[model samples]
Target: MKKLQIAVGIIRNENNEIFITRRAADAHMANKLEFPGGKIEMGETPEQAVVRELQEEVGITPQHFSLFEKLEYEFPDRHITLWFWLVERWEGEPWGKEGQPGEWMSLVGLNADDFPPANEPVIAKLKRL
Candidate 1:
């Protein structure tokens, strides 16, 4: 099967903590901690997807951003490639605009087990920085 392409933003605050959101209960990887983002639509670039996804899911508009990393993973039923973006500047507060749980956390305190397997490497990489 073709891997699903996703674009997620790693938004950091003044203190360098990253923003994360909880997956909706009804969604895949439900209840897991996730960087705010969604699938890259047919006509949208990964950059555009990050901008749109962040706005729709977290109420934030990325002002300055760039590609940070890329990784791929597979579960029994699906596979995906995640495009991680570092959102250096943005507008508006980061909140769960869709009513999902959300929070800001330090990189050193982010636990891979709290997220989907796809995000484990990202979390590990972040903690080293």
Candidate 2:
């Protein structure tokens, strides 16, 4: 299976809402609600990857963020190592720059079923906080 290194950001606002985006229909885990991020490029740190991904995918430059956790999971189709980060501060309003639908929503009632299995662990931990 192909291995992937991905960087994901959980952006939280002053009102305590989380920024989430929907995956494109043609992408893996299509239409699932997911944090904004992308593959880590060669010679780039996970932090740099997350920041760059957020800027490109959501139009925000992450200024304050820290590693929340790292998860390694394998789906039937591929393997992935995901670096999840908490983005507490950023520089721009987030929107779907890639044409994917996105919104800032309260995390209180977000169901894990709405996300990919690989993302469920993060959601479970998020709810406890």
Candidate 3:
């Protein structure tokens, strides 16, 4: 199978709310909410990919962040390796530069039902950390 590399962010605000973005209706996740991120480019490290993805998709540059964990998933066509980052501080507010809707939600009230399947496990892990 082909390996696909991607990066995602878990952006938390001072209030402990996390940022989630809604995928476009036509997107693969279509209306599903997920962490802001995208595929890694040929020459980019996972961290670089996450930073670039955050800026490209949400218009923010994470100023304080760290790699939290890595996730892998398998589908019929490909295998995906996703790098997750915990972002505490960033420059500029997040807006949907890619034409998606972005929202800040309280982590206390977050649940698997609110996020995409691929992200559900990450959310569960966050709750424990």
Candidate 4:
């Protein structure tokens, strides 16, 4: 089966802390901590998806952003390729626009144990950026 393509953004602040979100309890893999983003749409570039996802999820829009890293993972029923981005500049306060839980956290304090297994490697790679 073709893997689903997803776009996730790593929006860190002046303090180098990154933004995170909580999945809706009713959704798949509920209660996981993840970077704010969503699936890549048919006609949107990954960059555009980044802009769209952030806005939809956290009421924030990227003023400037760039691609960061990519990785793929598979569960029994579905597979997905996650496209990560570095969002250094953006507008609006980050909140739970979609009504999912959200928060800001620092890299060193980011608890890998609390995040989705798919996000493990991405978190490690983020330490380098």
TM-score pick, better of 2 and 4 = 2
Which regions of candidate 3 deviate over 4 angstroms? 24-31, 41-43, 96-98
Would you list the clashing residue pairs of candidate 2? none
Give each model's whole-structure lDDT.
Answer: 0.66, 0.68, 0.67, 0.66
lDDT of 1 at 44: 72
Clash number for every model?
0, 0, 0, 0
Query: Superposing every Cα of model 1 onto the true structure, what RMSD results?
Result: 3.5
**How do the residues 5-123 of candidate 3 rate in per-residue lDDT, one tens digit apiece?**
87877677656776666664446756366666775645587767766666775676555468777787877898777777777755566763556566677766766665676666776
lDDT of 4 by residue, 37-79 (tens): 6655545776676567667655655454787777777778777
Candidate 4: clashing pairs of residues: none
Q: Encode model 2's per-residue lDDT on 1-129: one tens digit a residue.
A: 676788777677656677677564446766377776765644467767766666665675545578778787788898777887776755566663545566677766666776776577877786676
**Over the stretch 7-125, how does candidate 1's per-residue lDDT look in tens digits?**
77767765667767656444766637777667564457666766666676566554546777877777687777687777675556676354556666764577777677656787678
In terms of TM-score, how similar is model 1 to the real structure? Answer: 0.71
Sort the predicted structures by TM-score, highest score first: 3, 2, 1, 4
Which model scores highest in TM-score? 3
- The candidate, 2 or 3, that scores higher on TM-score is 3
Q: In model 1, which regions exceed 4 Å deviation?
A: 24-31, 62-64, 73-79, 96-99
